[PDB]
Amino acid sequence: DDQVKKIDKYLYAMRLSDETLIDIMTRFRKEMKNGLSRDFNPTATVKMLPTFVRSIPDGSEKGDFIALDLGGSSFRILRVQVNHEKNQNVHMESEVYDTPENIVHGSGSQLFDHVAECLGDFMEKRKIKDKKLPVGFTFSFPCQQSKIDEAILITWTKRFKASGVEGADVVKLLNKAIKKRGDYDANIVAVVNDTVGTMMTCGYDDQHCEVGLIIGTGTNACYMEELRHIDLVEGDEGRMCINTEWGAFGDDGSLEDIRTEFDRAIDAYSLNPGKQLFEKMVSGMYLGELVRLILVKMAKEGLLFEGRITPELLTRGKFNTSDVSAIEKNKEGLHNAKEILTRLGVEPSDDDCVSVQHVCTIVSFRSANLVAATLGAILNRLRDNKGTPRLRTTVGVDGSLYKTHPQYSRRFHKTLRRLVPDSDVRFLLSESGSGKGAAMVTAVAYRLAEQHRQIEETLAHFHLTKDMLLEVKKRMRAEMELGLRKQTHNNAVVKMLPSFVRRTPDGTENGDFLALDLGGTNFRVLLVKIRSGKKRTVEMHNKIYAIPIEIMQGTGEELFDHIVSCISDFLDYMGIKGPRMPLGFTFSFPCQQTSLDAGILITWTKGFKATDCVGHDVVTLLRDAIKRREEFDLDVVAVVNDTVGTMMTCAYEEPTCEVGLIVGTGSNACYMEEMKNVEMVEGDQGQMCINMEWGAFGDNGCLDDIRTHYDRLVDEYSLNAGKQRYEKMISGMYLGEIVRNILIDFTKKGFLFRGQISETLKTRGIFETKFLSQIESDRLALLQVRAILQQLGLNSTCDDSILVKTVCGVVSRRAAQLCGAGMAAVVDKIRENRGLDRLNVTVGVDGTLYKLHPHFSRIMHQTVKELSPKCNVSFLLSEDGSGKGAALITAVGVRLRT
Ligand SMILES: Nc1ncnc2c1ncn2[C@@H]1O[C@H](COP(=O)(O)OP(=O)(O)O)[C@@H](O)[C@H]1O
Ligand SMILES: O=P(O)(O)OC[C@H]1O[C@@H](O)[C@H](O)[C@@H](O)[C@@H]1O
Numbered sequence: 001d002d003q004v005k006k007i008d009k010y011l012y013a014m015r016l017s018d019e020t021l022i023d024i025m026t027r028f029r030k031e032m033k034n035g036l037s038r039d040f041n042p043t044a045t046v047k048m049l050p051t052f053v054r055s056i057p058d059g060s061e062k063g064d065f066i067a068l069d070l071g072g073s074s075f076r077i078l079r080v081q082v083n084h085e086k087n088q089n090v091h092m093e094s095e096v097y098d099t100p101e102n103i104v105h106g107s108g109s110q111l112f113d114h115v116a117e118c119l120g121d122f123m124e125k126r127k128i129k130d131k132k133l134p135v136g137f138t139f140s141f142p143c144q145q146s147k148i149d150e151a152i153l154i155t156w157t158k159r160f161k162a163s164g165v166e167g168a169d170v171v172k173l174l175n176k177a178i179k180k181r182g183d184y185d186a187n188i189v190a191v192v193n194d195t196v197g198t199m200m201t202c203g204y205d206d207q208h209c210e211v212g213l214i215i216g217t218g219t220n221a222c223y224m225e226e227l228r229h230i231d232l233v234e235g236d237e238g239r240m241c242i243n244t245e246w247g248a249f250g251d252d253g254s255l256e257d258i259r260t261e262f263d264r265a266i267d268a269y270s271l272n273p274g275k276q277l278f279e280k281m282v283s284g285m286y287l288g289e290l291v292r293l294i295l296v297k298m299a300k301e302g303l304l305f306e307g308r309i310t311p312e313l314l315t316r317g318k319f320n321t322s323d324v325s326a327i328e329k330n331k332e333g334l335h336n337a338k339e340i341l342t343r344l345g346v347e348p349s350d351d352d353c354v355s356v357q358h359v360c361t362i363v364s365f366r367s368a369n370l371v372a373a374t375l376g377a378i379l380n381r382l383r384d385n386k387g388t389p390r391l392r393t394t395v396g397v398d399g400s401l402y403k404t405h406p407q408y409s410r411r412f413h414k415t416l417r418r419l420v421p422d423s424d425v426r427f428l429l430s431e432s433g434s435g436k437g438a439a440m441v442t443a444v445a446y447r448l449a450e451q452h453r454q455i456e457e458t459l460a461h462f463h464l465t466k467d468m469l470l471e472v473k474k475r476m477r478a479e480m481e482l483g484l485r486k487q488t489h490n491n492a493v494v495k496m497l498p499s500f501v502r503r504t505p506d507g508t509e510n511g512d513f514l515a516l517d518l519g520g521t522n523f524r525v526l527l528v529k530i531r532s533g534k535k536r537t538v539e540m541h542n543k544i545y546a547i548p549i550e551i552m553q554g555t556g557e558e559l560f561d562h563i564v565s566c567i568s569d570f571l572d573y574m575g576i577k578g579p580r581m582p583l584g585f586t587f588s589f590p591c592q593q594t595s596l597d598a599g600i601l602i603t604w605t606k607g608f609k610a611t612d613c614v615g616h617d618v619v620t621l622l623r624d625a626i627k628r629r630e631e632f633d634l635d636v637v638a639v640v641n642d643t644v645g646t647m648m649t650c651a652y653e654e655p656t657c658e659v660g661l662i663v664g665t666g667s668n669a670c671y672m673e674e675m676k677n678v679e680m681v682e683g684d685q686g687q688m689c690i691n692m693e694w695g696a697f698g699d700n701g702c703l704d705d706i707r708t709h710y711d712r713l714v715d716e717y718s719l720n721a722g723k724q725r726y727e728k729m730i731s732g733m734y735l736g737e738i739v740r741n742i743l744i745d746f747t748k749k750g751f752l753f754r755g756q757i758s759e760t761l762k763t764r765g766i767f768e769t770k771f772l773s774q775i776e777s778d779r780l781a782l783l784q785v786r787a788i789l790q791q792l793g794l795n796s797t798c799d800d801s802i803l804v805k806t807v808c809g810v811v812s813r814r815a816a817q818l819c820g821a822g823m824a825a826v827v828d829k830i831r832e833n834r835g836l837d838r839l840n841v842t843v844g845v846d847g848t849l850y851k852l853h854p855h856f857s858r859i860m861h862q863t864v865k866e867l868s869p870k871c872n873v874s875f876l877l878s879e880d881g882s883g884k885g886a887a888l889i890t891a892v893g894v895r896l897r898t
């Protein structure tokens with residue numbers, strides 16, 4: 001009773017009561033919240049690192065894997081087969097590779113060259129060099145990870161200290177070393193901490209496993225946290241394993257009231273002074289050295305060995321944790337103490353053996369007590385997250401100390417269960433090591449990498465490089481020359497049609513005008529009043545009229561009768577009476593004009609298909625319908641494309657506006673060309689607005705090298721197969737169908753919606769301009785995208801929504817770059833043609849996709865700036881629609897009669 005009692009008093013600060021352990025537990029609860037907080041994480045000692053492992057195994061894992069295991073007492077390489085054969089969950093083979101101190105303490109290159117060489121040997125010996133086995137890496141050090149296949153070393157701990165590795169992605173270092181060998185290929189798909197491999201190994205057997213605990217060379221624990229509490233990982237969805245890195249608890253000085261002179265001494269002379277202070281009071285690397293330090297002081301005070309002190313006793317590292325373990329054995333402990341101490345150079349007495357055994361007891365029991373306190377905090381955290389009175393959970397455990405000391409796991413369990421009386425906790429020893437669990441992570445990581453690879457290969461066909469875009473620009477320019485020249489105009493796909501509008505507004509226009517706006521989303525009738533002079537004004541009124549698809553695709557007589565009925569209504573709606581008014585007809589389809597008021601429809605585009613219209617003068621069609629009604633008369637002065645009316649609407653205020661652009665249902669552009677270049681119209685004086693009809697660019701096969709399988713499908717299923725190919729890669733009627741076709745393919749490949757191609761997904765038109773624009777909105781978090789997808793009729797998850805948003809973005813970004821290339825061609829032609837070093841030009845623009853999409857206009861302006869750097873283009877969105885400009889055109893047309 002005496003000796004032990006006195007030893008108890010000497011090491012009293014090491015004998016922790018439950019009150020102190022509850023205090024430590026509470027401190028650690030606070031650290032865990034600091035490490036998860038976005039605000040305190042940069043200065044949190046307990047890093048709470050995201051692992052990107054979102055679940056314990058579910059039984060679907062299967063495959064043949066390689067697992068590396070580095071940082072614990074032994075470097076192992078394993079081949080793990082999982083459900084690779086019936087009635088064999090797992091099958092493992094393993095090899096330990098000697099890794100001496102000069103490799104662990106040398107350069108990073110030398111360390112990773114060592115790993116790559118042992119891996120080569122391992123694959124060589126088993127002839128698996130050509131199997132393409134996905135590789136998992138258990139690397140037991142704190143790492144910053146933004147994905148499963150990255151592991152940026154934060155700090156070396158334990159025995160390792162290789163230069164050039166802290167702050168580097170060890171997956172890249174390892175890849176580098178393997179490549180340098182040139183001997184074999186290795187696909188490193190996942191990096192995990194050993195706590196995480198332990199939790200996964202144990203979770204394969206026990207579905208309640210939510211914690212992985214290591215009490216070996218070093219000590220650490222991981223646990224399943226809720227995403228809503230993990231501030232540094234986006235999402236509030238589900239769970240994710242957190243690597244606490246609890247060994248650094250106390251590194252800021254918060255456990256200085258628990259630490260003793262011995263702890264300070266072992267810390268000062270370690271590889272990493274001041275760091276991993278909690279770990280140094282607990283793990284196998286340090287407990288025997290803590291005991292040696294205590295014996296040395298005691299000896300110096302004559303409390304042991306009659307003051308005998310040998311140099312062996314004084315040798316750091318000479319008394320290990322295995323000696324502590326042997327000394328604490330029930331029957332042989334004292335005998336083992338005798339032998340061990342005898343080898344120290346002393347001649348220990350029997351009483352010395354009893355004393356030394358008690359010092360081992362106190363050191364190893366304080367460690368067990370400390371880990372019980374920190375693990376108790378994680379269990380209270382899990383209990384709080386689950387929200388129940390009692391906690392049921394399984395802790396997976398590994399580490400030499402826990403596995404080999406004759407009393408530690410028993411004492412740890414008992415203290416743990418006493419500290420957390422509300423939990424029913426099972427401790428499962430991880431007998432297979434981290435490798436099994438690492439393989440389960442590797443199986444899931446490999447499946448997701450394969451799905452990512454195929455998604456990226458599909459989406460890469462929509463990526464356009466700057467050189468490719470310069471080539472599209474060049475092709476547009478060449479097609480513009482083809483359509484303007486007499487010799488080549490008839491077989492040119494970009495028609496470059498004269499509008500007979502020869503100047504922008506000169507400020508003298510004035511009068512009251514009617515206008516029609518047909519071909520976009522809304523058919524409208526308008527009344528426009530323009531007044532010039534002191535303070536010019538424009539006053540406009542309009543009504544929208546529906547045009548059912550049966551009249552858009554019925555007879556020309558029916559369509560024009562319908563337009564005339566709407567005009568009759570609008571005249572009553574406005575109270576218009578009196579002499580017949582001048583009218584400008586915005587008709588957004590390609591027409592061959594012989595003057596401002598005559599336009600023969602060349603072909604239908606978008607969704608129109610009315611019969612007996614193509615090859616007819618549409619002004620004559622309108623005038624015929626007015627005569628059939630025999631009520632009002634009208635003076636149709638002009639037929640205009642919507643590009644041209646949009647340009648004139650903008651040029652009313654801007655002298656630099658010489659270009660019009662539509663990105664709505666369809667896509668097209670117009671611009672002021674020199675009469676000398678307009679070979680199809682006699683005269684070489686002045687300018688003429690040209691309606692490009694650029695939608696048909698590509699209808700001669702000139703964009704076949706960038707059209708995808710999905711563009712081909714959209715055109716093949718369209719109303720005008722083979723026509724308007726460029727427009728079908730850009731505009732609002734067609735982008736949603738490109739997206740829909742990509743989503744169907746991904747759903748069939750099992751990447752989205754559980755492989756379920758619903759009937760909603762098979763319905764054409766679902767990704768309308770409104771919805772595509774909503775899904776990409778920056779200030780719309782997950783819940784709203786899913787809300788939209790679910791609301792359309794699709795069974796979408798958070799991951800589903802993210803992939804849906806990505807696909808939408810790839811398609812709208814390519815449409816905006818393609819539109820940008822065509823616009824870069826037009827502005828450089830104007831610049832180059834006027835012999836200018838720089839051009840300052842305004843483009844009047846309109847269209848629903850352009851107006852509503854969150855990124856299209858920005859991407860498109862950026863593209864034009866990069867592809868035509870000597871042009872400074874300003875894009876001005878019409879507020880008023882094509883109307884103000886159609887009326888301006890009509891005014892000059894009346895004027896030009898006189
Ligand atoms: N909190 C503590 N810290 C350090 N040593 C302790 C502590 N509590 C008890 N001990 C010591 O642990 C030993 C008791 O071990 P215990 O696991 O409870 O029973 P057993 O004798 O079966 O191993 C005694 O040597 C006692 O002095
Ligand atoms: O440091 P140790 O004593 O080796 O214990 C910890 C080690 O246990 C082994 O079973 C695991 O496979 C390793 O991944 C782990 O690092």
Ligand SMILES: O=P(O)(O)OC[C@H]1O[C@@H](O)[C@H](O)[C@@H](O)[C@@H]1O
Binds near residue numbers: 522586
């Ligand atoms: O097809 P949309 O989305 O309707 O866009 C194109 C249309 O935009 C309107 O603002 C113009 O006034 C119309 O003349 C033009 O045709």
Ligand SMILES: OC[C@H]1O[C@H](O)[C@H](O)[C@@H](O)[C@@H]1O
Binds near residue numbers: 140193
């Ligand atoms: O090997 C057990 C533990 O040792 C150290 O504490 C490492 O920092 C940690 O990553 C690891 O899990």
Ligand SMILES: OC[C@H]1O[C@H](O)[C@H](O)[C@@H](O)[C@@H]1O
Binds near residue numbers: 519664
């Ligand atoms: O409405 C925008 C454009 O749609 C189509 O591309 C029409 O062919 C064109 O004339 C019109 O400008």
